[PDB]
Short mmCIF file of C-alpha atoms and ligand atoms in Angstrom, two decimals:
data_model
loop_
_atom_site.label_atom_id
_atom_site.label_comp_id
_atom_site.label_asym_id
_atom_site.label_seq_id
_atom_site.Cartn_x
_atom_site.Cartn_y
_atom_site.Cartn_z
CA UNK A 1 96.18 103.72 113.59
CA UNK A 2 98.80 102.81 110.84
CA UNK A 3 99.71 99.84 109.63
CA UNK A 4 103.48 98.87 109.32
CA UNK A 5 103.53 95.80 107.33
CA UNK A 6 102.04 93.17 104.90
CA UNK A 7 103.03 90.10 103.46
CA UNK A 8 102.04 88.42 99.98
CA UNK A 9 103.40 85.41 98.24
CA UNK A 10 103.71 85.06 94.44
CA UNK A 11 101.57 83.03 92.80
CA UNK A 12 102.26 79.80 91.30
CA UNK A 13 102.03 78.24 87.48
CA UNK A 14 99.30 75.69 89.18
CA UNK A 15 97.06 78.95 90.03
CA UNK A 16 95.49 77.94 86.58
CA UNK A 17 93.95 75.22 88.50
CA UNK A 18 92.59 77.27 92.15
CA UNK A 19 89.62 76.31 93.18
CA UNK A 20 86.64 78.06 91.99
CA UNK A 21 82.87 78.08 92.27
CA UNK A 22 82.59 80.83 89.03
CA UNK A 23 82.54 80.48 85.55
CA UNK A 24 84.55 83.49 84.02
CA UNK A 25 87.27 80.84 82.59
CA UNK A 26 90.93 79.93 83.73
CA UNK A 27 93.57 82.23 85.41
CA UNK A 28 96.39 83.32 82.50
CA UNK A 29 99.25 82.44 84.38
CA UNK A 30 101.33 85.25 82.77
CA UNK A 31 99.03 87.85 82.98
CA UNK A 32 98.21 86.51 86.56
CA UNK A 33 101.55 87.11 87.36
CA UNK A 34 101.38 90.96 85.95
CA UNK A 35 98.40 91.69 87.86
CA UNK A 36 100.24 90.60 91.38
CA UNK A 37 103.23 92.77 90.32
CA UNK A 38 100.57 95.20 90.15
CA UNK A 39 99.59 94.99 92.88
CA UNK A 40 102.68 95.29 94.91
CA UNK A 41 103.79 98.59 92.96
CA UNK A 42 100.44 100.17 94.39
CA UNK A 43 101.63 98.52 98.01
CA UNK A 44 105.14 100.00 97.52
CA UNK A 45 103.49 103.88 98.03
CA UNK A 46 101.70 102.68 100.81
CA UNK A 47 103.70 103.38 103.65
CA UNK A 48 104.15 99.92 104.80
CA UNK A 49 107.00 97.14 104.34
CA UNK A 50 106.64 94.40 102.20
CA UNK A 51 107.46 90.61 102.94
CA UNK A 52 107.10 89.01 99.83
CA UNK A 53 106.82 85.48 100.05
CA UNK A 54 108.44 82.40 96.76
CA UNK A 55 105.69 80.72 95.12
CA UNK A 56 104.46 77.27 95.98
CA UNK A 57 103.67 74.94 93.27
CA UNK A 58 101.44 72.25 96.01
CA UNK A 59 99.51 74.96 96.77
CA UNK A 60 97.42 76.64 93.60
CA UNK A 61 95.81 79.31 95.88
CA UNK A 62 98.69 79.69 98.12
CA UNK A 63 98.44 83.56 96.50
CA UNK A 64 95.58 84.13 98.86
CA UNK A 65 97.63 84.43 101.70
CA UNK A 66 94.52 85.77 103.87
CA UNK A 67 92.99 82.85 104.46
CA UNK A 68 96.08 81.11 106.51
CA UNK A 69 96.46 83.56 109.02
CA UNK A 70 94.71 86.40 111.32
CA UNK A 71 97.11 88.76 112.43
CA UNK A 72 95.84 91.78 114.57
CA UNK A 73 98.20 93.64 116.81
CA UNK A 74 98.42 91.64 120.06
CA UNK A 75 99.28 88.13 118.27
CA UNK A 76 98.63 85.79 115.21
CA UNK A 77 96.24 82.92 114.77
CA UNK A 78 97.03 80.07 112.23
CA UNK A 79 93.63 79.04 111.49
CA UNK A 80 92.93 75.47 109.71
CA UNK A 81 91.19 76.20 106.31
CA UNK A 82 88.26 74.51 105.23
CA UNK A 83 89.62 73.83 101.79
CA UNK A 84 91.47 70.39 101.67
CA UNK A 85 93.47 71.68 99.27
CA UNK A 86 94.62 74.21 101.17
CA UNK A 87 95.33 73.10 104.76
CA UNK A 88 98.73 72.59 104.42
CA UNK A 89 99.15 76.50 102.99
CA UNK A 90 99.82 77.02 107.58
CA UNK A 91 102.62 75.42 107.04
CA UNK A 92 104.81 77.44 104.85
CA UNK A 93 103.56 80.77 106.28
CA UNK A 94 104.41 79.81 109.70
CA UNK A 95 107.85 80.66 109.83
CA UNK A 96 106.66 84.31 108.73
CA UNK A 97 104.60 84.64 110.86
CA UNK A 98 106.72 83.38 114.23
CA UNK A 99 109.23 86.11 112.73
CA UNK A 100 106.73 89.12 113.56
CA UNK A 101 105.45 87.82 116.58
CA UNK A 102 107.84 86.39 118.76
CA UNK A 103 105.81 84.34 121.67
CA UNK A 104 102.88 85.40 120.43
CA UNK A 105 101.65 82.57 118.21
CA UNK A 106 98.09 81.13 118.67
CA UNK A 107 96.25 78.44 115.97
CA UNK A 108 93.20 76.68 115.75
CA UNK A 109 92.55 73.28 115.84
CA UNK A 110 90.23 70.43 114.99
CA UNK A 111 87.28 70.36 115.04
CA UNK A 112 87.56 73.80 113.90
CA UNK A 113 87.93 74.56 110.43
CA UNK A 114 89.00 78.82 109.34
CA UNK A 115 89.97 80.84 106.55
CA UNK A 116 90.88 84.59 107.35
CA UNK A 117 88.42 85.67 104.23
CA UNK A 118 85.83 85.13 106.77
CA UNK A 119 86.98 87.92 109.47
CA UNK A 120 86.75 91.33 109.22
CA UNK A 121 88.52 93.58 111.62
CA UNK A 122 86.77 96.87 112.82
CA UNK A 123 88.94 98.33 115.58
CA UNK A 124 89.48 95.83 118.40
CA UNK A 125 86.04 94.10 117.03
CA UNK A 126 86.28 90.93 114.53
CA UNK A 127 83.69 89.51 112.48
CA UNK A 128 83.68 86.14 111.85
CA UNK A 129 81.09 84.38 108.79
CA UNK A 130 79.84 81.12 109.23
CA UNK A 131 80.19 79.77 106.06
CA UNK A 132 81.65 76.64 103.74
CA UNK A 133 84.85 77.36 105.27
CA UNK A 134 84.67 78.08 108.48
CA UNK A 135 82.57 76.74 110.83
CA UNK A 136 81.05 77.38 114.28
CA UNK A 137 83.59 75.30 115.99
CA UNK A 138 86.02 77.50 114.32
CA UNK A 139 84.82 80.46 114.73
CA UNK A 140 84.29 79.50 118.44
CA UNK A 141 88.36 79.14 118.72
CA UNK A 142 88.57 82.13 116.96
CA UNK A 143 86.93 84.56 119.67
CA UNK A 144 88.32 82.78 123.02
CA UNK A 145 91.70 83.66 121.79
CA UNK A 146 90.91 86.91 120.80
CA UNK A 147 88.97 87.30 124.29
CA UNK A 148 92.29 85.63 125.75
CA UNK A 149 94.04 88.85 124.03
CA UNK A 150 91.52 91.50 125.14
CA UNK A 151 90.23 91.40 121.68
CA UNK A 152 86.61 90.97 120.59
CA UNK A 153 84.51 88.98 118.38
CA UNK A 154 80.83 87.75 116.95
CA UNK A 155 79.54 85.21 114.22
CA UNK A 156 78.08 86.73 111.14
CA UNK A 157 75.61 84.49 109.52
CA UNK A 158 75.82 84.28 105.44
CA UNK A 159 74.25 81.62 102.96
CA UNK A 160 75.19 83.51 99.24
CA UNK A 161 78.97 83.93 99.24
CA UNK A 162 82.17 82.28 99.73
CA UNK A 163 83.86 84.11 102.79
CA UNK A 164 82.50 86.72 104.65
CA UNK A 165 85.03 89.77 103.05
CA UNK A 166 83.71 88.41 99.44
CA UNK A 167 80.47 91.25 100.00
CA UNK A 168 81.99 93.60 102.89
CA UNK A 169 85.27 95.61 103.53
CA UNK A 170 85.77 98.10 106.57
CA UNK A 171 87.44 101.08 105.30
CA UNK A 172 88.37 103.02 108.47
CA UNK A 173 86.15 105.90 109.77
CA UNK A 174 83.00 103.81 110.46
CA UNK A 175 82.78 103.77 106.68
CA UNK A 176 81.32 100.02 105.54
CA UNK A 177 81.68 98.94 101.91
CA UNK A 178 78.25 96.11 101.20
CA UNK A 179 76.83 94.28 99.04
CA UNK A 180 74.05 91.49 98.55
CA UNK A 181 72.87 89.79 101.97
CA UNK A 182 74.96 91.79 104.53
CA UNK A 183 73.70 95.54 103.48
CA UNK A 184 70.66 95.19 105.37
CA UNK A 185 72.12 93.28 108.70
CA UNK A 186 71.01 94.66 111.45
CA UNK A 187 74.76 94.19 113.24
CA UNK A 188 75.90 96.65 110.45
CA UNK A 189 73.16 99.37 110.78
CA UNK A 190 74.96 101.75 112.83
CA UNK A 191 77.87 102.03 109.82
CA UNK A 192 77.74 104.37 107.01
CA UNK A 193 77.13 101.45 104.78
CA UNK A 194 78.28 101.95 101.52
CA UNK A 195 75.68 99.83 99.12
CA UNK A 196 77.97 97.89 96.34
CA UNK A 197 75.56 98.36 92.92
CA UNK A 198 74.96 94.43 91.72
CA UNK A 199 76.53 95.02 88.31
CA UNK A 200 80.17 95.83 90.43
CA UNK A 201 79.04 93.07 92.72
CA UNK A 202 83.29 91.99 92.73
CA UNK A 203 84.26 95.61 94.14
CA UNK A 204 82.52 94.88 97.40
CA UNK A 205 86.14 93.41 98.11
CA UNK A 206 88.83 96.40 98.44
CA UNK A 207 91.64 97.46 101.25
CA UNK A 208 91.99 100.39 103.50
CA UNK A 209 95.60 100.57 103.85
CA UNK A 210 97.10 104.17 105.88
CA UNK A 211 94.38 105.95 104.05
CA UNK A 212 95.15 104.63 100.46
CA UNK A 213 91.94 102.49 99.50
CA UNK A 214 93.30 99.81 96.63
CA UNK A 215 90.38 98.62 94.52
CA UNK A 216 90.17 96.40 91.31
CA UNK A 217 90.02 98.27 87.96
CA UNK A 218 87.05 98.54 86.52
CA UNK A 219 84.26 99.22 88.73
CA UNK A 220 83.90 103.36 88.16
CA UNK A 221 80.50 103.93 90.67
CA UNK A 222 82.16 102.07 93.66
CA UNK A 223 85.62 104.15 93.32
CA UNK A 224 83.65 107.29 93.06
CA UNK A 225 81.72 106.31 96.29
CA UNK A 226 85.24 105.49 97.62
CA UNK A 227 87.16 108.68 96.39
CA UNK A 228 84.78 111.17 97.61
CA UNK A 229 85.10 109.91 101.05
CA UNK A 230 88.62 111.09 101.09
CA UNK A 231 90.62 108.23 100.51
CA UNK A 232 93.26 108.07 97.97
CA UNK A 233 92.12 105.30 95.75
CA UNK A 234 94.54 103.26 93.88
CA UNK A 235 92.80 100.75 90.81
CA UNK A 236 94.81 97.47 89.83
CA UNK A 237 93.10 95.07 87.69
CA UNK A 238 92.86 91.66 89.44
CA UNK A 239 90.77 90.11 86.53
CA UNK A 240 92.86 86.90 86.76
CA UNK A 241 92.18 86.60 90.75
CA UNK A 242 88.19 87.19 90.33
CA UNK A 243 88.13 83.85 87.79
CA UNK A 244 89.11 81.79 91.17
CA UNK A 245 87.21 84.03 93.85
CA UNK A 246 89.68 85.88 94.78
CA UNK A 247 90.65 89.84 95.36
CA UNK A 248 92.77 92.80 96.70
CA UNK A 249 91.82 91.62 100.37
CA UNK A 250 92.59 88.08 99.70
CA UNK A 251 96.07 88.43 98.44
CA UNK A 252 98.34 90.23 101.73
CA UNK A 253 98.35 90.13 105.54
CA UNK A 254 97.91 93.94 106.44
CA UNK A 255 99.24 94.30 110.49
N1 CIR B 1 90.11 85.55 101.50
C1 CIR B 1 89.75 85.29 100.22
O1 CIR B 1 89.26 86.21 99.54
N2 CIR B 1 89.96 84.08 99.75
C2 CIR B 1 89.64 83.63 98.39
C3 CIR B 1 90.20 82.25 98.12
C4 CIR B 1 89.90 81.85 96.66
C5 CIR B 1 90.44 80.43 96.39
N3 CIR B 1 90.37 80.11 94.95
C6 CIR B 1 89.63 79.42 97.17
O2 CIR B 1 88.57 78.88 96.65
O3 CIR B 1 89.95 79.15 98.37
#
């Protein structure tokens, strides 16, 4: 499999103030702004299109584009983030997302509460976390309309992070990047798991994209475990998106 496309959106001057749990101090908006540029060079030699979406000043985190939408290649779920802040961030993907999949538009609704950081795709198999910002209900939602597409799905259970993807990425090839609680799930066991060391904790969170792995600077034992695989890795720093929880993954739609 190949992906064709992803989509991003620029972030905003009120990404200063995204919501974060960590202490590593406040986005630079400038240098922010460098590292997303960044980040779309190293997309540009991925064999893919780009839809690159105008920045939303309402919406701080409206960067991490992830969390509005699940897109696999049968249809597209808005889900209904957790956040407060960041409900509203369905709204202005919406149209985007209707433009890649005509009739084929599914969402979730209350009582369910999503965010996209939560699922991990693995072939026609989705993982869904139960965790601050996406709930059982949700995830519930989730899998019927997956099921509904011939698609599959099952809850992951976490306590220590903010969305599931924060400690796991599937790189293709039954290779499983992991760190903290999910390296010794038993639901994971039959991967080639890939143990994240704790001091590159943040690297945990990279994208398989056509058999380019993109990675955040600075982590040199995880992109060695990563390059000798076979992948071609490609390192952008994305110190400004780690200050508000946030990653490679986080920031595009890959379908
Ligand atoms: N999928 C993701 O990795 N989402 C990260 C969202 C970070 C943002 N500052 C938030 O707290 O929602």
């Amino acid at each position: 499999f190949m992906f064709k496309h992803i989509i991003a959106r620029t972030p905003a001057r009120s990404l200063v103030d995204g919501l974060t749990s960590s202490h590593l101090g406040k986005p630079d908006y400038a240098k922010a702004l460098e590292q997303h540029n960044a980040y779309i060079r190293a997309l540009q030699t991925c064999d893919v299109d780009i839809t690159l979406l105008p920045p939303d000043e309402r919406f701080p985190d409206s960067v991490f584009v992830e969390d509005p939408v699940l897109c696999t290649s049968r249809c597209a779920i808005i889900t209904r983030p957790g956040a407060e802040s960041r409900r509203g961030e369905t709204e202005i993907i919406e149209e985007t997302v209707q433009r890649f999949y005509p009739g084929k538009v599914e969402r979730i609704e209350a009582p369910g509460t999503v965010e996209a950081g939560d699922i991990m795709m693995v072939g026609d198999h989705f993982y869904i976390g139960e965790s601050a910002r996406t709930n059982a209900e949700g995830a519930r939602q989730m899998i019927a309309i997956l099921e509904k597409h011939g698609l599959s799905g099952s809850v992951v259970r976490l306590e220590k992070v903010l969305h599931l993807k924060t400690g796991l990425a599937y790189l293709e090839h039954n290779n499983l990047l992991a760190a903290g609680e999910f390296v010794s799930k038993p639901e994971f066991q039959d991967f080639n798991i890939i143990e994240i060391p704790e001091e590159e904790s943040y690297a945990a969170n990279c994208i398989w994209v056509n058999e380019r792995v993109i990675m955040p600077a600075g982590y040199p034992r995880t992109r060695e475990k990563i390059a000798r695989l076979g992948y071609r890795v490609i390192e952008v720093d994305t110190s400004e998106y780690r200050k508000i929880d946030g990653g490679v993954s986080s920031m595009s739609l890959r379908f």
